[PDB]
Structure 1
Amino acid sequence: GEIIYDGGLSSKLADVVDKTTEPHNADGAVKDGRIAPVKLDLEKQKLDKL
């Protein structure tokens, strides 16, 4: 017979980034006006620059 429903484009709720991401603030629907997180080179092992 005639086909009324056979499927279609399916909407997915979540996009799961399968990779390690550096820390970030809000972007997209909510944009964060504050400064980005400061990357601090702390907890050094060998003593450089001192």
Structure 2
Amino acid sequence: GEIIYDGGLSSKLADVVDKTTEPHNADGAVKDGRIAPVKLDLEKQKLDKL
């Protein structure tokens, strides 16, 4: 017989990144107008620039 329903394109609720991500603000449907998080070089084991 004629095929009425044979699978199809399936929507996914969420995607999951398999790579480690740097901290970030929202850049999707919600866009954050504030400055991106500031990355500071702290907790240095050996002395430098002092």
TM > 0.5 fold call: yes
Aligned CA-pair RMSD: 0.4
Counting aligned pairs with the same residue, the percent is: 100
Q: Post-superposition shift, 1:42?
A: 0.4
Name whichever structure is richer in strand by fraction.
1
Give structure 1 regions of 4+ aligned residues with deviation exceeding 3 angstroms: none
| TM-score, scaled to structure 2 | 0.97
For residues 2-29 of structure 1, give each alpha carbon's deviation from its aligned partner in whole angstroms, at most 9, with x where no partner exists.
1000010000001100100000001010
